[PDB]
Amino acid sequence: VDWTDAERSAIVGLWGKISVDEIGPQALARLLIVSPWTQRHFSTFGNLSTPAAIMGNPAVAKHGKTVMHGLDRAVQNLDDIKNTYVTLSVMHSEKLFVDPDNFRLLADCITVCVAAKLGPAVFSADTQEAFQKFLAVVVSALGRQYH
Amino acid sequence: VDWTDAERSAIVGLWGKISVDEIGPQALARLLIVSPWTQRHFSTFGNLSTPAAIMGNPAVAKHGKTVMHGLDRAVQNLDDIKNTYVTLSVMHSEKLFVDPDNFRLLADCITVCVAAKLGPAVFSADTQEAFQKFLAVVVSALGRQYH
Amino acid sequence: SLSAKDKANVKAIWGKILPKSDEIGEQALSRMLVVYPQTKAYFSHWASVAPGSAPVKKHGITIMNQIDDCVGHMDDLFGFLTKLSELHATKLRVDPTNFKILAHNLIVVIAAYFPAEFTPEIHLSVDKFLQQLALALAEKYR
Amino acid sequence: SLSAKDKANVKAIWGKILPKSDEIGEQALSRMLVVYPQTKAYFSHWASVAPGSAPVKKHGITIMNQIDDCVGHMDDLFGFLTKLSELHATKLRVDPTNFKILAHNLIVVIAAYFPAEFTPEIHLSVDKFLQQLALALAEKYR
Numbered sequence: 402v403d404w405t406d407a408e409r410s411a412i413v414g415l416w417g418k419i420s421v422d423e424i425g426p427q428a429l430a431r432l433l434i435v436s437p438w439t440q441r442h443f444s445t446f447g448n449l450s451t452p453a454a455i456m457g458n459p460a461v462a463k464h465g466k467t468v469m470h471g472l473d474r475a476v477q478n479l480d481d482i483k484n485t486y487v488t489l490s491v492m493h494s495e496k497l498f499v500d501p502d503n504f505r506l507l508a509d510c511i512t513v514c515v516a517a518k519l520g521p522a523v524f525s526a527d528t529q530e531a532f533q534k535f536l537a538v539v540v541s542a543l544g545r546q547y548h
Numbered sequence: 549v550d551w552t553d554a555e556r557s558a559i560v561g562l563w564g565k566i567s568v569d570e571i572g573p574q575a576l577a578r579l580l581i582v583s584p585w586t587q588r589h590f591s592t593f594g595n596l597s598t599p600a601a602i603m604g605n606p607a608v609a610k611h612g613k614t615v616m617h618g619l620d621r622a623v624q625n626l627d628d629i630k631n632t633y634v635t636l637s638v639m640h641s642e643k644l645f646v647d648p649d650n651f652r653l654l655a656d657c658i659t660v661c662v663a664a665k666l667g668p669a670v671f672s673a674d675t676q677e678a679f680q681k682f683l684a685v686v687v688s689a690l691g692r693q694y695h
Numbered sequence: 696s697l698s699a700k701d702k703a704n705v706k707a708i709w710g711k712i713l714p715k716s717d718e719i720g721e722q723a724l725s726r727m728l729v730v731y732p733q734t735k736a737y738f739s740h741w742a743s744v745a746p747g748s749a750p751v752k753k754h755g756i757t758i759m760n761q762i763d764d765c766v767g768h769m770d771d772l773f774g775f776l777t778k779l780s781e782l783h784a785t786k787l788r789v790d791p792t793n794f795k796i797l798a799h800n801l802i803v804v805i806a807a808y809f810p811a812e813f814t815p816e817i818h819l820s821v822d823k824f825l826q827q828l829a830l831a832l833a834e835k836y837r
Numbered sequence: 838s839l840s841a842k843d844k845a846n847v848k849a850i851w852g853k854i855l856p857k858s859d860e861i862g863e864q865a866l867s868r869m870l871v872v873y874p875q876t877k878a879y880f881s882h883w884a885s886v887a888p889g890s891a892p893v894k895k896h897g898i899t900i901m902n903q904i905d906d907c908v909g910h911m912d913d914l915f916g917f918l919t920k921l922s923e924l925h926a927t928k929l930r931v932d933p934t935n936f937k938i939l940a941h942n943l944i945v946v947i948a949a950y951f952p953a954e955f956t957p958e959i960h961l962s963v964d965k966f967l968q969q970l971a972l973a974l975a976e977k978y979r
C-alpha cells in the first residue's frame with residue numbers, strides 16, 4: 402500500500418459524494434441476497450424470508466449503516482488501516498465467527514452499489530481502481546487477526 | 549507482516565532441511581503439467597509436448613533451481629519481503645508478461661513438492677502454516693509492481 | 696444451474712443492455728484492465744490498454760457480442776461455449792481464474808448503466824449466469 | 838470435465854489412499870483448520886479444532902468417506918452430490934470458496950503420504966477431480 406496522490410484524492414472525493422446511510426443498507430441487503438450464506442449472521446434481524454423482506458428490513462438497514470461508518474475510519478486515515486481494524490478483526494473472528502471471505506463479498510457489493518449511485522462517468526475506471534485498492538486493504542485488515 | 553517467533557523458526561528451520569536444487573525443478577515441472585497455460589512462457593525451453601518430456605527437461609530444471617534461489621533472499625529477510633521483489637515483480641509484469649496468478653499456483657506446487665519430500669510428520673500442520681504464510685507474502689510481493 | 700426465474704431475469708436485463716452493448720463492453724474491459732492490472736498480461740500485443748482506446752473498444756465489442764449470444768443459450772452454455780473454451784485454453788492460454796474478474800467488472804458496469812433495473816434479485820441471476828459462462832469457458836481446460 | 842483417463846487415474850491413486858483413508862482425512866481437515874484459519878469460522882461449536890483431536894478425527898472420516906464414495910460416482914458427480922450441496926448451502930451456510938481450500942490440503946496430504954505415486958499426471962487428475970467435486974458441492978447454492 403503506497404497510495405498515489407491520485408488514488409488518495411479519488412477515495413476521499415468518492416467517499417464525500419456518497420450517502421453511507423443510503424449505500425450501507427443497499428450493499429448489505431445485496432450481499433444477503435447475492436451471497437445467501439451470509440444470512441448465517443443475521444437470522445435474528447427479523448424477516449429475511451424473501452429478497453423483498455431483506456430489502457425492506459429496518460435492522461439490516463441499520464447494520465449496513467454501521468458497516469459504512471466502520472469504513473469512515475479507514476478513509477480518515479489511509480496510512481494506518483491495519484491498526485484501525487485490529488479490534489474489529491478480533492471481534493469478527495472470535496465473537497462473531499464470520500468467514501472473512503464474506504468481507505470480500507461485501508466489498509464487492511459496496512462497489513456495485515456505489516457504481517449504481519454514481520454512474521460510469523463519475524465512477525470512472527481510475528476511480529474504481531483507487532476504490533478497489535482501498536477495499537482490498539480494508540478487507541485484508543479485517544481478516545488479519547484470524548488465527 | 550506480523551510474524552510470530554514460532555513462524556519465524558519454522559520457516560528458517562524448514563528452508564534449512566530442503567535442497568533447493570531438487571525441489572525447484574520438481575515444482576516447476578509440476579506447475580507446467582497441472583497448470584499448463586503456464587507453458588505459454590517456456591516454449592523456448594525445449595521439449596514440453598507430454599508430461600514425460602517436461603520432467604527431465606534440464607532447461608525447466610535449471611530455471612526451477614533459479615526460482616527457489618529467488619526465495620533465498622526472502623528467507624534471509626522475512627521483514628523486508630515487499631522491497632526484495634520490486635525488480636523481479638516489474639520484470640515478470642513488463643518484460644515477461646506473467647499473469648501473477650501463476651505465482652500462487654507455483655507456490656502451491658512448491659508446497660506439494662516439499663510435503664512429498666519431507667512427509668506428514670516433519671511437514672506438520674504448524675510447519676505448513678508458517679510456510680503458507682511465507683509463500684503468501686512472497687506471492688503478494690511478486691505481484692506488487694503490476695500496474 | 697440457472698432456474699427458469701434466473702433465465703427470465705437475465706433476458707429482461709439484457710433487453711436494456713443490448714442497445715448499449717458496445718459501450719458496455721468497452722467499459723467492462725477497460726475496468727478489468729485498469730482495476731485488475733494482473734489481466735494486462737494477456738494483452739501486451741495491443742497498441743494500448745488504456746480505457747476507451749481503440750484496441751479496448753474493438754475487443755470489448757468482441758466480448759459483449761459473445762455474451763449477448765450466450766443469453767439466447769442458457770439452456771446449454773457449456774455446449775455453446777466448447778469451441779471458445781478450447782480457444783482460450785489451447786491457443787490463448789488464459790489462466791481461467793481471470794474469467795470471474797471479467798464477470799465482476801461487467802456486473803459493475805451493468806449496475807452503473809442501469810441502476811434502477813439492477814436490483815439484488817436481478818444481480819443474483821446475472822452473477823449466476825456469468826459464473827456459469829465462466830465455468831463453460833473453463834470446461835475444455837486441462 | 839474428467840476424461841476417461843482422469844477417471845482411471847483417480848481410481849488408481851485412491852487404491853493407495855484407501856488403506857489410510859481415516860488418517861488422511863484427519864490430516865487434511867487438520868491442515869485446512871490450522872493453515873487456513875479462515876475456515877475455523879464454521880467449526881466453533883466443536884470441542885476442539887486441534888489437529889488429531891476427537892472432533893477432527895471424526896469429521897475427517899466423514900469427509901474422506903464421502904470423497905471415497907465420490908470416486909465410485911465420477912460419471913454423475915453433480916447428481917451424486919445434490920443432497921450434500923443443499924445441506925452445505927442451506928443448513929450449514931458454508932461459503933463455497935472454502936471447498937477449494939479443503940481440496941488443496943487433501944492434495945498436500947496425498948503427496949505427503951504417497952510421494953512416489955503422486956506424479957504430476959496423477960496430481961493433475963486428482964486436482965480436476967477435486968475441483969469438480971467442489972463445483973458439485975456448490976451446485977445447489979443460490
Ligand code: HEM
Nearest residue numbers: 439442443467468471472489493497499503504507508543
Ligand atoms: C466491510 C466490512 C465490515 C465492516 C467495516 C464491519 C464493521 C462492523 C462494526 C463497526 C460492527 C459493530 C461492532 C460493535 O457494535 O461494536 C460490526 C458488527 C457485526 N458484524 Fe461486521 N463489518 C463488516 C463486515 C461484516 C460481514 C461480511 C459480516 C457477516 C456476513 C458481518 C457480521 C457482523 C455481525 C453479526 C455483527 C454484530 C451485530 C450485532 O451484534 O447484532 N460484518 N461490524
Ligand code: HEM
Nearest residue numbers: 586589590611614615618619636644646650651654655690
Ligand atoms: C515463486 C514465484 C517466482 C519467482 C520467485 C521467480 C523468480 C524468477 C527469477 C529470479 C528469474 C530470473 C531473473 C533474472 O534473470 O535476474 C525469473 C525469470 C523468469 N520467470 Fe520467474 N519466478 C517466479 C514465477 C514465475 C512464473 C509463475 C512464471 C510463469 C509461469 C515465470 C516465468 C519466468 C520466465 C519466462 C523467466 C525468464 C527465464 C529465462 O531467463 O529465460 N516465473 N523468475
Ligand code: HEM
Nearest residue numbers: 734737738757758761762782787789793794797798829832
Ligand atoms: C469471461 C468472459 C469472456 C468472453 C465471453 C470472451 C470471449 C472472447 C471471444 C469471443 C474472443 C474472440 C476469439 C475469436 O478469435 O473468435 C476472445 C478472445 C480473447 N480473450 Fe476472451 N473472453 C472472455 C474472458 C477473457 C479473459 C478474462 C481474458 C484474460 C484476462 C481473456 C483473454 C482473451 C484474449 C487474450 C483474446 C484474444 C484477443 C486478441 O489477441 O486481440 N478472455 N474472447
Ligand code: HEM
Nearest residue numbers: 876879880899900903904924929931935936939940971974
Ligand atoms: C469439498 C469437500 C467436502 C466434503 C466431501 C464434505 C462433506 C461433508 C459431509 C459428508 C458432512 C456431513 C453431512 C451430514 O451431516 O450429513 C459435512 C458436514 C459439514 N461440513 Fe463439509 N464437506 C466438504 C467441505 C467443507 C468445507 C470446505 C467446509 C468449511 C470450511 C465444510 C463445512 C462443514 C460443516 C461445518 C459440517 C457440519 C459438521 C458438524 O457440525 O459437526 N465442509 N461435510
